[PDB]
Design a protein around this ligand. Structure first.
Ligand SMILES: Cc1ccc(OCCN(C)C)cc1C(=O)N[C@H](C)c1cc(-c2cnn(C)c2)cc(-c2cnn(C)c2)c1
Ligand SMILES: [Cl-]
Ligand SMILES: [Cl-]
Ligand SMILES: [Cl-]
Ligand SMILES: [Cl-]
Ligand SMILES: [Zn+2]
Ligand SMILES: [Zn+2]
Ligand SMILES: [Zn+2]
Ligand SMILES: [Zn+2]
Length: 312
Protein backbone atom coordinates (compact mmCIF):
# COMPACT_ATOMS: atom_id res chain seq x y z
CA UNK A 1 0.00 0.00 0.00
CA UNK A 2 0.96 3.64 -0.60
CA UNK A 3 -0.37 6.82 0.99
CA UNK A 4 -1.75 9.73 -1.05
CA UNK A 5 -3.71 12.96 -0.55
CA UNK A 6 -7.21 13.67 -1.85
CA UNK A 7 -8.78 17.12 -2.08
CA UNK A 8 -11.38 19.22 -3.85
CA UNK A 9 -9.97 22.72 -3.29
CA UNK A 10 -6.31 21.77 -2.62
CA UNK A 11 -6.63 24.12 0.37
CA UNK A 12 -7.81 21.31 2.66
CA UNK A 13 -5.94 18.02 2.26
CA UNK A 14 -7.16 14.60 3.39
CA UNK A 15 -4.69 11.74 3.77
CA UNK A 16 -5.60 8.30 2.41
CA UNK A 17 -3.95 4.91 2.02
CA UNK A 18 -4.62 2.99 -1.19
CA UNK A 19 -4.15 -0.59 -2.32
CA UNK A 20 -2.02 -1.06 -5.44
CA UNK A 21 -4.26 -3.75 -7.01
CA UNK A 22 -7.47 -1.68 -6.95
CA UNK A 23 -7.58 1.21 -9.40
CA UNK A 24 -7.94 4.75 -8.07
CA UNK A 25 -11.47 4.99 -9.45
CA UNK A 26 -13.11 2.24 -7.41
CA UNK A 27 -11.57 3.41 -4.11
CA UNK A 28 -12.09 7.17 -4.54
CA UNK A 29 -14.62 7.66 -7.33
CA UNK A 30 -13.67 9.88 -10.27
CA UNK A 31 -10.07 10.89 -9.59
CA UNK A 32 -7.84 13.32 -11.49
CA UNK A 33 -4.09 14.00 -11.32
CA UNK A 34 -2.73 17.22 -12.87
CA UNK A 35 -5.47 17.10 -15.51
CA UNK A 36 -5.31 13.40 -16.35
CA UNK A 37 -8.21 11.16 -15.36
CA UNK A 38 -6.76 8.35 -13.23
CA UNK A 39 -10.07 6.59 -12.61
CA UNK A 40 -8.98 3.64 -14.77
CA UNK A 41 -5.30 3.82 -13.76
CA UNK A 42 -4.00 1.69 -10.90
CA UNK A 43 -1.71 3.22 -8.25
CA UNK A 44 1.91 3.48 -9.36
CA UNK A 45 4.99 3.89 -7.19
CA UNK A 46 5.46 7.50 -8.31
CA UNK A 47 1.97 8.32 -7.00
CA UNK A 48 3.21 8.38 -3.38
CA UNK A 49 2.22 11.48 -1.45
CA UNK A 50 0.74 12.91 -4.65
CA UNK A 51 -2.27 15.22 -4.43
CA UNK A 52 -5.39 14.01 -6.24
CA UNK A 53 -8.56 15.91 -7.07
CA UNK A 54 -11.66 13.82 -6.35
CA UNK A 55 -15.36 14.27 -6.92
CA UNK A 56 -16.96 14.86 -3.50
CA UNK A 57 -18.30 11.62 -2.02
CA UNK A 58 -18.94 12.64 1.61
CA UNK A 59 -20.36 15.69 3.35
CA UNK A 60 -16.95 17.09 4.29
CA UNK A 61 -15.81 17.13 0.66
CA UNK A 62 -19.18 18.49 -0.51
CA UNK A 63 -18.99 21.44 1.90
CA UNK A 64 -15.35 22.18 1.09
CA UNK A 65 -16.17 22.00 -2.62
CA UNK A 66 -18.89 24.62 -2.28
CA UNK A 67 -16.81 26.89 -0.05
CA UNK A 68 -14.14 27.05 -2.78
CA UNK A 69 -16.16 26.91 -6.02
CA UNK A 70 -19.61 28.17 -4.86
CA UNK A 71 -21.41 25.45 -6.82
CA UNK A 72 -22.93 22.04 -6.11
CA UNK A 73 -22.91 20.94 -9.77
CA UNK A 74 -21.40 17.42 -9.85
CA UNK A 75 -20.27 17.94 -13.46
CA UNK A 76 -18.24 21.06 -12.59
CA UNK A 77 -15.12 19.15 -11.53
CA UNK A 78 -15.02 17.07 -14.71
CA UNK A 79 -15.55 20.01 -17.04
CA UNK A 80 -12.95 22.04 -15.13
CA UNK A 81 -10.34 19.27 -15.26
CA UNK A 82 -11.03 18.70 -18.97
CA UNK A 83 -10.43 22.36 -19.81
CA UNK A 84 -7.30 22.41 -17.64
CA UNK A 85 -5.70 19.67 -19.75
CA UNK A 86 -5.81 22.07 -22.71
CA UNK A 87 -5.13 25.36 -20.91
CA UNK A 88 -1.95 23.90 -19.40
CA UNK A 89 -0.65 23.47 -22.96
CA UNK A 90 -1.46 27.07 -23.94
CA UNK A 91 1.20 29.79 -23.89
CA UNK A 92 0.63 32.89 -21.74
CA UNK A 93 3.10 35.56 -22.90
CA UNK A 94 3.47 38.94 -21.24
CA UNK A 95 2.54 41.72 -23.68
CA UNK A 96 2.58 45.38 -22.56
CA UNK A 97 2.96 44.12 -19.01
CA UNK A 98 -0.31 42.19 -19.37
CA UNK A 99 -0.76 38.42 -19.48
CA UNK A 100 -2.19 37.25 -22.82
CA UNK A 101 -2.71 33.86 -24.50
CA UNK A 102 -1.01 32.50 -27.63
CA UNK A 103 -3.91 31.74 -29.97
CA UNK A 104 -4.99 28.06 -29.65
CA UNK A 105 -8.31 26.13 -29.60
CA UNK A 106 -10.20 29.32 -30.67
CA UNK A 107 -9.23 31.10 -27.44
CA UNK A 108 -9.22 34.61 -28.94
CA UNK A 109 -12.28 35.53 -26.87
CA UNK A 110 -10.68 34.12 -23.70
CA UNK A 111 -7.51 36.18 -24.08
CA UNK A 112 -9.59 39.32 -24.70
CA UNK A 113 -11.50 38.74 -21.45
CA UNK A 114 -8.31 37.89 -19.55
CA UNK A 115 -6.67 41.11 -20.76
CA UNK A 116 -9.75 43.13 -19.76
CA UNK A 117 -9.96 41.73 -16.22
CA UNK A 118 -6.39 42.90 -15.56
CA UNK A 119 -7.50 46.48 -16.29
CA UNK A 120 -10.78 46.79 -14.36
CA UNK A 121 -11.42 46.53 -10.63
CA UNK A 122 -13.17 43.29 -9.71
CA UNK A 123 -13.44 40.98 -6.69
CA UNK A 124 -14.63 37.42 -7.31
CA UNK A 125 -16.93 35.73 -4.80
CA UNK A 126 -15.76 32.10 -5.25
CA UNK A 127 -12.36 31.70 -3.57
CA UNK A 128 -11.34 29.45 -6.47
CA UNK A 129 -11.89 32.29 -8.94
CA UNK A 130 -10.19 34.93 -6.78
CA UNK A 131 -7.12 32.78 -6.07
CA UNK A 132 -6.68 31.97 -9.77
CA UNK A 133 -7.36 35.63 -10.60
CA UNK A 134 -4.33 36.63 -8.51
CA UNK A 135 -2.00 34.04 -10.05
CA UNK A 136 -3.30 34.84 -13.55
CA UNK A 137 -2.08 38.42 -13.13
CA UNK A 138 1.28 37.06 -11.94
CA UNK A 139 1.60 35.25 -15.29
CA UNK A 140 0.29 31.72 -14.56
CA UNK A 141 -3.28 31.82 -15.89
CA UNK A 142 -3.85 28.18 -16.85
CA UNK A 143 -6.08 27.49 -13.84
CA UNK A 144 -7.95 30.77 -14.30
CA UNK A 145 -8.81 30.13 -17.95
CA UNK A 146 -9.99 26.59 -17.18
CA UNK A 147 -12.22 27.94 -14.41
CA UNK A 148 -13.70 30.58 -16.73
CA UNK A 149 -14.67 27.83 -19.18
CA UNK A 150 -16.25 25.70 -16.45
CA UNK A 151 -18.19 28.59 -14.91
CA UNK A 152 -19.37 29.67 -18.38
CA UNK A 153 -20.38 26.10 -19.38
CA UNK A 154 -18.15 26.50 -22.45
CA UNK A 155 -15.74 23.82 -23.66
CA UNK A 156 -12.36 24.09 -25.35
CA UNK A 157 -12.67 24.90 -29.03
CA UNK A 158 -16.18 26.25 -28.68
CA UNK A 159 -16.68 29.76 -30.03
CA UNK A 160 -17.21 32.40 -27.35
CA UNK A 161 -18.65 35.89 -27.09
CA UNK A 162 -16.65 38.24 -24.85
CA UNK A 163 -19.73 40.16 -23.66
CA UNK A 164 -21.43 36.92 -22.62
CA UNK A 165 -18.29 35.68 -20.86
CA UNK A 166 -17.85 38.96 -18.96
CA UNK A 167 -21.50 38.81 -17.90
CA UNK A 168 -21.10 35.30 -16.47
CA UNK A 169 -17.99 36.36 -14.54
CA UNK A 170 -19.71 39.53 -13.27
CA UNK A 171 -22.44 37.38 -11.70
CA UNK A 172 -19.65 35.66 -9.73
CA UNK A 173 -18.16 38.97 -8.56
CA UNK A 174 -19.22 41.34 -5.78
CA UNK A 175 -21.04 44.06 -7.70
CA UNK A 176 -23.56 44.67 -4.90
CA UNK A 177 -22.30 48.24 -4.32
CA UNK A 178 -22.72 49.03 -8.03
CA UNK A 179 -25.77 51.20 -8.74
CA UNK A 180 -27.20 52.70 -11.93
CA UNK A 181 -30.14 55.12 -12.00
CA UNK A 182 -31.86 55.76 -15.33
CA UNK A 183 -34.67 58.03 -16.51
CA UNK A 184 -36.87 57.40 -19.55
CA UNK A 185 -38.78 60.51 -20.66
CA UNK A 186 -41.77 60.05 -22.97
CA UNK A 187 -44.08 62.88 -24.02
CA UNK A 188 -47.13 60.65 -23.56
CA UNK A 189 -46.25 58.57 -20.49
CA UNK A 190 -43.83 60.99 -18.81
CA UNK A 191 -40.72 60.48 -16.65
CA UNK A 192 -39.96 57.10 -15.07
CA UNK A 193 -36.90 56.52 -12.89
CA UNK A 194 -35.51 52.98 -12.71
CA UNK A 195 -32.64 51.73 -10.55
CA UNK A 196 -30.37 48.85 -11.56
CA UNK A 197 -27.81 47.02 -9.42
CA UNK A 198 -25.19 44.34 -9.86
CA UNK A 199 -24.51 43.11 -13.39
CA UNK A 200 -27.16 45.37 -14.93
CA UNK A 201 -25.56 48.44 -13.34
CA UNK A 202 -22.24 47.96 -15.17
CA UNK A 203 -23.40 46.57 -18.54
CA UNK A 204 -25.43 48.13 -21.34
CA UNK A 205 -26.25 46.75 -24.79
CA UNK A 206 -27.01 49.28 -27.50
CA UNK A 207 -24.20 51.82 -27.79
CA UNK A 208 -20.43 51.90 -27.38
CA UNK A 209 -20.23 55.55 -26.30
CA UNK A 210 -20.44 56.15 -22.55
CA UNK A 211 -20.99 59.83 -23.36
CA UNK A 212 -23.99 59.04 -25.57
CA UNK A 213 -25.49 57.03 -22.71
CA UNK A 214 -25.07 60.13 -20.54
CA UNK A 215 -26.69 62.30 -23.23
CA UNK A 216 -29.52 59.85 -23.91
CA UNK A 217 -30.42 56.95 -26.21
CA UNK A 218 -33.64 56.43 -28.16
CA UNK A 219 -35.48 53.34 -26.91
CA UNK A 220 -39.10 52.35 -27.67
CA UNK A 221 -41.71 53.17 -25.04
CA UNK A 222 -44.78 51.09 -24.19
CA UNK A 223 -47.00 53.55 -26.07
CA UNK A 224 -44.83 53.21 -29.20
CA UNK A 225 -43.48 56.77 -29.26
CA UNK A 226 -39.71 56.45 -28.98
CA UNK A 227 -38.45 57.84 -25.67
CA UNK A 228 -35.07 59.11 -24.50
CA UNK A 229 -33.23 57.03 -21.88
CA UNK A 230 -30.23 58.71 -20.25
CA UNK A 231 -27.92 58.02 -17.33
CA UNK A 232 -28.77 59.86 -14.11
CA UNK A 233 -26.35 58.43 -11.54
CA UNK A 234 -23.61 55.79 -11.65
CA UNK A 235 -21.65 54.32 -8.72
CA UNK A 236 -19.29 51.61 -10.00
CA UNK A 237 -15.53 51.14 -10.50
CA UNK A 238 -16.16 50.71 -14.25
CA UNK A 239 -18.81 50.44 -16.95
CA UNK A 240 -19.03 48.14 -19.98
CA UNK A 241 -20.63 49.58 -23.12
CA UNK A 242 -21.53 46.99 -25.74
CA UNK A 243 -23.13 47.16 -29.18
CA UNK A 244 -23.22 44.94 -32.27
CA UNK A 245 -19.95 45.14 -34.21
CA UNK A 246 -19.61 48.34 -36.22
CA UNK A 247 -16.91 50.73 -37.39
CA UNK A 248 -15.83 52.90 -34.47
CA UNK A 249 -13.00 55.36 -33.81
CA UNK A 250 -11.13 54.84 -30.53
CA UNK A 251 -9.28 57.92 -29.27
CA UNK A 252 -6.31 57.77 -26.91
CA UNK A 253 -7.18 58.63 -23.32
CA UNK A 254 -10.98 58.49 -23.67
CA UNK A 255 -11.40 54.81 -22.70
CA UNK A 256 -9.68 51.97 -20.87
CA UNK A 257 -9.92 49.01 -23.25
CA UNK A 258 -12.13 47.67 -26.02
CA UNK A 259 -13.03 44.49 -27.93
CA UNK A 260 -12.50 44.27 -31.69
CA UNK A 261 -14.59 41.59 -33.41
CA UNK A 262 -13.91 40.80 -37.07
CA UNK A 263 -15.60 38.30 -39.37
CA UNK A 264 -18.87 36.44 -39.60
CA UNK A 265 -21.24 36.07 -36.67
CA UNK A 266 -20.30 33.23 -34.27
CA UNK A 267 -17.06 32.43 -36.13
CA UNK A 268 -15.06 35.69 -36.08
CA UNK A 269 -11.71 36.42 -34.37
CA UNK A 270 -11.32 38.82 -31.39
CA UNK A 271 -8.62 41.49 -30.83
CA UNK A 272 -7.94 43.63 -27.76
CA UNK A 273 -7.36 47.40 -27.84
CA UNK A 274 -6.03 49.11 -24.69
CA UNK A 275 -5.45 52.83 -23.97
CA UNK A 276 -1.85 53.46 -22.76
CA UNK A 277 0.73 56.13 -23.65
CA UNK A 278 -0.25 55.07 -27.22
CA UNK A 279 -3.12 52.86 -28.43
CA UNK A 280 -1.87 49.26 -28.21
CA UNK A 281 -3.39 46.31 -30.09
CA UNK A 282 -3.01 42.81 -28.64
CA UNK A 283 -3.95 39.89 -30.92
CA UNK A 284 -2.97 36.92 -28.79
CA UNK A 285 0.83 36.89 -28.70
CA UNK A 286 1.27 39.65 -31.30
CA UNK A 287 1.44 43.34 -30.41
CA UNK A 288 0.99 46.42 -32.60
CA UNK A 289 0.63 50.06 -31.60
CA UNK A 290 -0.72 53.21 -33.26
CA UNK A 291 -1.87 56.69 -32.31
CA UNK A 292 -5.44 56.39 -33.61
CA UNK A 293 -7.79 53.48 -34.17
CA UNK A 294 -10.80 52.91 -36.42
CA UNK A 295 -12.27 49.42 -36.68
CA UNK A 296 -15.09 47.02 -35.77
CA UNK A 297 -15.60 47.39 -32.02
CA UNK A 298 -18.28 45.62 -29.98
CA UNK A 299 -17.31 46.30 -26.32
CA UNK A 300 -15.72 49.39 -24.76
CA UNK A 301 -14.72 49.64 -21.10
CA UNK A 302 -14.58 52.96 -19.22
CA UNK A 303 -13.36 54.01 -15.79
CA UNK A 304 -15.80 55.37 -13.22
CA UNK A 305 -16.13 56.03 -9.51
CA UNK A 306 -19.20 58.20 -9.05
CA UNK A 307 -21.25 60.17 -11.57
CA UNK A 308 -24.29 62.41 -11.17
CA UNK A 309 -25.92 64.05 -14.17
CA UNK A 310 -26.83 67.71 -14.62
CA UNK A 311 -30.09 67.25 -16.55
CA UNK A 312 -33.20 68.46 -14.74
C1 LIG B 1 -17.98 34.79 -31.59
C2 LIG B 1 -19.29 34.45 -30.93
C3 LIG B 1 -19.39 33.29 -30.16
C4 LIG B 1 -20.56 32.93 -29.54
C5 LIG B 1 -21.68 33.73 -29.66
O1 LIG B 1 -22.81 33.28 -29.03
C6 LIG B 1 -24.07 33.85 -29.41
C7 LIG B 1 -25.10 32.90 -28.87
N1 LIG B 1 -25.59 33.29 -27.51
C8 LIG B 1 -25.68 32.11 -26.60
C9 LIG B 1 -26.90 33.99 -27.59
C10 LIG B 1 -21.62 34.89 -30.42
C11 LIG B 1 -20.43 35.26 -31.05
C12 LIG B 1 -20.37 36.54 -31.83
O2 LIG B 1 -20.42 36.52 -33.06
N2 LIG B 1 -20.26 37.67 -31.13
C13 LIG B 1 -20.11 38.98 -31.77
C14 LIG B 1 -19.57 39.97 -30.75
C15 LIG B 1 -21.39 39.48 -32.43
C16 LIG B 1 -21.39 39.60 -33.82
C17 LIG B 1 -22.50 40.10 -34.50
C18 LIG B 1 -22.47 40.22 -35.97
C19 LIG B 1 -23.40 40.83 -36.83
N3 LIG B 1 -23.04 40.76 -38.10
N4 LIG B 1 -21.86 40.10 -38.08
C20 LIG B 1 -21.16 39.82 -39.32
C21 LIG B 1 -21.49 39.77 -36.83
C22 LIG B 1 -23.63 40.48 -33.78
C23 LIG B 1 -23.65 40.36 -32.39
C24 LIG B 1 -24.86 40.74 -31.63
C25 LIG B 1 -25.12 40.60 -30.25
N5 LIG B 1 -26.32 41.04 -29.93
N6 LIG B 1 -26.85 41.47 -31.09
C26 LIG B 1 -28.20 42.04 -31.13
C27 LIG B 1 -26.01 41.31 -32.12
C28 LIG B 1 -22.53 39.86 -31.73
CL1 LIG C 1 -12.26 12.92 3.99
CL1 LIG D 1 -22.90 31.36 -4.56
CL1 LIG E 1 -20.56 33.31 -6.88
CL1 LIG F 1 -11.83 55.77 -19.25
ZN1 LIG G 1 -21.14 32.62 -4.77
ZN1 LIG H 1 -6.14 21.50 -27.55
ZN1 LIG I 1 -44.84 56.37 -23.66
ZN1 LIG J 1 -10.42 32.98 -32.98
Amino acid sequence: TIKVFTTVDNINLHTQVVDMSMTYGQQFGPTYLDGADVTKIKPHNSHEGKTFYVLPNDDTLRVEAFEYYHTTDPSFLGRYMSALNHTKKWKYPQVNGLTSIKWADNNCYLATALLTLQQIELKFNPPALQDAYYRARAGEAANFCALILAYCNKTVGELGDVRETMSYLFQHANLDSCKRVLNVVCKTCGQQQTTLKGVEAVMYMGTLSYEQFKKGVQIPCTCGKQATKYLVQQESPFVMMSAPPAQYELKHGTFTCASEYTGNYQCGHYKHITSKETLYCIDGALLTKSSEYKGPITDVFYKENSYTTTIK
